[PDB]
Design a protein around this nucleic acid. Structure first.
Ligand code: MG
Ligand code: MG
Ligand code: MG
Length: 414
DNA sequence: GGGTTGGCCGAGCG
């Protein structure tokens, strides 16, 4: 039925957005009550559950057998009324970057209701989000946060004083009172969630419904910092919980800290005292892995050297891991890592930083090709592993021709 | 503030 079930859902989303663009919150709550009680909404709910690797909960259920789809949506045809939330399965996922990050595992019926009210919340949250909120929206990458940082902080387009701040509180530490105050919902179901734990209390508020909440909480900031009526002094650029606010002093940025601490005070949120520091460009703040400075009246969004270190930690871990593997496995595992840290910044000033990265992975590969043969000469390992393909010699890759793809060769789009 | 290439000294024993 999926030839249609995206379409009518999305048309109803469009109508909910048209309702929010005039006043008509009656129309909003009506069409949310309707899209919550559509067949197509429930079918989209069970697809967006089932295609996210469903596993064991306390209220255990299945994905497959292809009637549990149709009978599950036929069950929650009734289930808005006696819809009870059950708790989550507090179970880790054991990551390898240094922790075991928790992920509270909720019931698949609860996840179907999270997908239903998620696609009810979305068109209201598109039109009620800030014009410069770049976190987790539709059609917005982290790179357009840097593009907004460019047109905001270009030639004289600010005046050189920037707070870099960040939010305290681990989980949805928002006061549940305030969540029931103003989020466009049917507040029985929202009340039922927020009593029932609903997200295992090690969240970071950046379980797909929780970012919609964390966006809707943090969208008064732009119109509240429109209180400062200066030319380009205060601009807010925000990725989901990282924002930097411009200025031209350290005291008018103390006005902005007072405003923002009043704004977060209405919730359970605060700017800290430790992280939140005003800093004069050109000295520089690190924004989403990108360092912003001026370097004497340029901008130079460089990828910061706490992004470079995490990248070389990824490659160092791969080549300590494939320490005695095949060469073609080392090609096949290093190649997506380098291509991923390539296309994530193929837009800004990264070319020289790409060459220093390719130097650095070359010496990692030379200790690769030289550790592996313990008593053979260096011309032997060189012509064994590194094979000339163009003008250049020292291309890591043998045979056609399969070889590592250089991060230096990624052709930056201005 | 985008492009392109370099790096490799040999030998014996285990
Ligand atoms: Mg250099
Ligand atoms: Mg021996
Ligand atoms: Mg022996």
């Amino acid at each position: 039925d999926w030839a249609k079930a995206n379409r009518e859902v999305k048309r109803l989303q469009v109508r909910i957005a048209k309702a929010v663009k005039e006043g008509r919150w009656g129309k909003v709550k009506a069409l949310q009550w309707l899209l919550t009680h559509s067949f197509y909404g429930k079918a989209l709910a069970v697809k967006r559950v089932t295609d996210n690797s469903g596993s064991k909960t306390p209220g255990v259920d299945g994905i497959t057998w292809s009637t549990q789809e149709q009978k599950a949506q036929a069950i929650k045809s009734l289930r808005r009324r006696g819809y009870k939330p059950q708790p989550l399965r507090r179970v880790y996922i054991p990551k390898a970057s240094g922790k075991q990050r928790p992920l509270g595992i909720p019931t698949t019926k609860d996840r179907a209701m999270q997908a239903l009210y998620a696609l009810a919340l979305e068109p209201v949250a598109e039109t009620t989000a800030d014009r410069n909120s770049y976190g987790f929206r539709q059609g917005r990458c982290t790179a357009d946060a840097a593009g907004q940082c460019f047109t905001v902080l270009g030639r004289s387009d600010c005046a050189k004083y920037i707070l870099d701040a960040d939010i305290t509180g681990c989980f949805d530490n928002i006061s549940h009172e305030w969540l029931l105050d103003n989020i466009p919902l049917d507040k029985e179901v929202l009340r039922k969630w927020l009593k029932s734990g609903f997200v295992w209390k090690q969240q970071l508020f950046p379980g797909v419904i929780s970012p919609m909440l964390a966006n809707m909480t943090l969208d008064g900031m732009e119109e509240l910092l429109k209180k400062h009526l200066r030319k380009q002094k205060v601009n807010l650029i925000r990725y989901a919980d990282d924002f930097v606010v411009t200025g031209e002093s350290k005291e008018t940025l103390e006005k902005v800290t007072t405003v923002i601490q009043e704004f977060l005070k209405e919730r359970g949120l605060t700017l800290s005292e430790e992280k939140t520091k005003v800093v004069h460009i050109e000295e520089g703040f690190d924004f989403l892995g990108w360092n912003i400075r001026k370097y004497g009246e340029k901008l130079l969004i460089k990828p910061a050297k706490k992004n470079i270190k995490a990248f070389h930690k990824k490659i160092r871990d791969a080549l300590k891991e494939l320490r005695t593997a095949t060469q073609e496995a080392v090609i096949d595992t290093l190649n997506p890592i380098i291509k991923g840290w390539a296309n994530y910044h193929r837009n800004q000033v990264s070319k020289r930083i790409f060459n220093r990265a390719d130097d650095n992975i070359w010496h990692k590969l030379w200790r690769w090709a030289k550790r592996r043969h313990p008593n053979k000469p260096a011309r032997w390992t060189k012509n064994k592993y590194f094979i000339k393909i163009g003008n250049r010699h020292w291309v890591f890759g043998t045979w056609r021709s399969r070889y590592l793809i250089k991060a230096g060769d990624t052709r930056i789009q201005r």
